[PDB]
């Protein structure tokens, strides 16, 4: 009986970990995209002060 | 005088009543007992080792 818990945990395992991959990497440009869209707006602006 | 009490005894123990089992040889119990306990130790080995994963 045991053998077969630990083949369906194993499964779960197995299933689990890509979901994990992927998020993590989806949150890890996501945070990068709104850092250099910031880091844009500050500069676009700055130049455009100047000039004026 | 010993073979008089065997062949009573003999005689005492067929006129004996007793409710209905199963009994193995009596030769035999020793070894299967000792292979009973090896088996003992192998499947709670494993089946400790299967728990703990």
């Known amino acids: ?52 | 005088h010993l073979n008089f009490l065997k062949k009573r005894l003999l005689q005492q123990c067929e006129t004996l009543k007793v409710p209905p089992k199963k009994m193995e040889d009596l030769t035999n119990v020793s070894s299967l007992l000792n292979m009973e306990r090896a088996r003992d130790k192998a499947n709670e080995e494993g089946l400790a080792l299967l728990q703990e994963e």
């Open chain 1, 1 to 52: 009986k045991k053998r077969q818990r630990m083949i369906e945990v194993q499964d779960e395992l197995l299933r689990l970990e890509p979901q994990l991959k992927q998020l993590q990497t989806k949150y890890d440009e996501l945070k990068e995209r709104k850092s250099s869209l910031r880091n844009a707006a500050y500069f676009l602006s700055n130049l455009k002060q100047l000039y004026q």
